[PDB]
């Protein structure tokens, strides 16, 4: 038994300074052998994520030993969730839901069970795509970063600033920062529509549009008491403006390249820490973390924004849309709504 599947392959590269378009991806049939080795499972793909880090995988050299480049005419891959259809792995049964970071962009797959994590849909009230975002790594990154590195003190009247506030994890800080005890949460953003979405929908107390040129003064209006915590998801000039407004005994969390000397001098004089946050060093916090996120969500205390495209044929269109940076939150493609067995 071979089964015919559809796969999305890298058709062409945009060039390092180029803009990805849907035509950089191609759907192609593939004949997949139905056989399972010891430990393998056959999965049906339900949801796939598209994320900004993937941009560099379309380049021949990703400038990073953390990311392997995608290869021409080969299936792409990333965050995914599916259902087990057949298993030769003791930890997985037909009907289990599983995730991977390296889920291939195809309709069905044969995968090593040891690279899959079983997930429990009751945690997300059956909204399975939330396991790729707010009840997955992005939510966990946001929660563990603040919880473990923010030094938040309930009743201390702290202001936290979050750069890259319209991204999948940055967009959850308005809610998570408040739930975790922060009194004020200010987002930094690239458009007016995004600023108003953060603030009307995602519980940010204020938002700064960094493309409209009076950024320092905007930030000052948003942060009348200065900045106590900075979650830096960008770096560069935005971070230099932000650091200039930081209070004594402040904390910068990078989610470290040297600062300009005048900025470094402010950092030192004001006793500001600046530390890399690496979420994979907090694996023992993951399970309690997902339970917390799930609880908030079920309570209605954590609202999530996702954009969901439909169909494996629309991966390229969704990737392109994701690249225009218009949407707020997690970009998802629904490959199947079929969890039958």
UniProtKB/Swiss-Prot annotation:
GO cellular component: a single term: cytosol
Catalytic activities: 13,14-dihydro-15-oxo-prostaglandin E2 + NAD(+) = 15-oxoprostaglandin E2 + NADH + H(+); 13,14-dihydro-15-oxo-prostaglandin E2 + NADP(+) = 15-oxoprostaglandin E2 + NADPH + H(+); 13,14-dihydro-15-oxo-PGF2alpha + NADP(+) = 15-oxoprostaglandin F2alpha + NADPH + H(+); 13,14-dihydro-15-oxo-prostaglandin E1 + NADP(+) = 15-oxoprostaglandin E1 + NADPH + H(+)
Annotated residues for binding of NADP(+): 167-170, 194, 210, 233, 277-279, 327
Pfam families, sorted: ADH_N_2, ADH_zinc_N
Gene Ontology terms describing biological process: prostaglandin metabolic process
Binding site for substrate: 101-102, 278-280
Compartmental location: Cytoplasm
CDD domains: PTGR2
Expression sites by tissue: Widely expressed with highest levels in adipose tissues.
Entries under InterPro entries matching the protein: ADH-like_C, ADH_N_2, GroES-like_sf, MDR_fam, NAD(P)-bd_dom_sf, PTGR2
MF terms in GO: 15-oxoprostaglandin 13-oxidase [NAD(P)+] activity
Domain of life: Eukaryota
EC number in record: 1.3.1.48
Main location: cytoplasm
UniProt entry keywords in alphabetical sequence: Cytoplasm, Lipid metabolism, NADP, Oxidoreductase
PANTHER family: PROSTAGLANDIN REDUCTASE, PROSTAGLANDIN REDUCTASE 2
Subunit structure, interactors included: Monomer.
Function: Functions as 15-oxo-prostaglandin 13-reductase and acts on 15-keto-PGE1, 15-keto-PGE2, 15-keto-PGE1-alpha and 15-keto-PGE2-alpha with highest activity towards 15-keto-PGE2. Overexpression represses transcriptional activity of PPARG and inhibits adipocyte differentiation.
Family according to the record: Belongs to the NADP-dependent oxidoreductase L4BD family.
Protein name: Prostaglandin reductase 2
Species of origin: Mus musculus
């Amino acid at each position: 038994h071979h089964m015919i599947i559809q796969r999305v392959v890298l058709n062409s590269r945009p060039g390092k300074n180029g803009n990805p378009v849907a035509e950089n991806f191609r759907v192609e049939e593939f004949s997949l052998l139905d056989a399972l080795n010891e430990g393998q499972v056959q999965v049906r793909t339900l949801y796939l994520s598209v994320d900004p880090y993937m941009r560099c995988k379309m380049n021949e050299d990703t400038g990073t030993d953390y990311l392997a480049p995608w290869q021409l005419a080969q299936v792409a891959d990333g965050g995914g969730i599916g259902i087990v259809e057949e298993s030769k792995h003791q930890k997985l049964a037909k009907g289990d839901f599983v995730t991977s970071f390296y889920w291939p962009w195809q309709t069905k797959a044969i995968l090593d069970g040891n690279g899959l994590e079983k997930v429990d849909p009751q945690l997300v009230d059956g909204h399975l795509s939330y396991f790729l975002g707010a009840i997955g790594m992005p939510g966990l990154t946001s929660l563990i970063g603040v919880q473990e590195k923010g030094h938040i003190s309930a009743g201390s009247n702290q202001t936290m600033v979050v750069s890259g506030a319209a991204g999948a994890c940055g967009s959850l800080a308005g809610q998570i920062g408040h739930l975790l005890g922060c009194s004020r949460v200010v987002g930094i953003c690239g458009t007016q529509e995004k600023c108003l979405f953060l603030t009307s929908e995602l519980g940010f107390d204020a938002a700064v549009n960094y493309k409209t040129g009076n950024v320092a003064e905007q930030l000052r209006e948003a942060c009348p008491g200065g900045v106590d915590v900075y979650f830096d998801n960008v770096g560069g000039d935005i971070s230099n403006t932000v650091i200039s407004q930081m209070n004594e005994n402040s904390h910068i969390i990078l989610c470290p390249p040297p600062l300009p000397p005048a900025v470094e001098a402010i950092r030192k004089e004001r006793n500001i820490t600046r530390e890399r946050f690496t979420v994979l060093n907090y694996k023992d916090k993951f399970e309690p973390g997902i339970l917390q996120l799930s609880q908030w969500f079920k309570e209605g205390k954590l609202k999530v924004k996702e954009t969901v495209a439909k169909g494996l044929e629309n991966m390229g269109v969704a990737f392109q849309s994701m690249m225009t940076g218009g949407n707020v939150g997690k970009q998802i493609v629904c490959i199947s709504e079929d969890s039958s067995l």
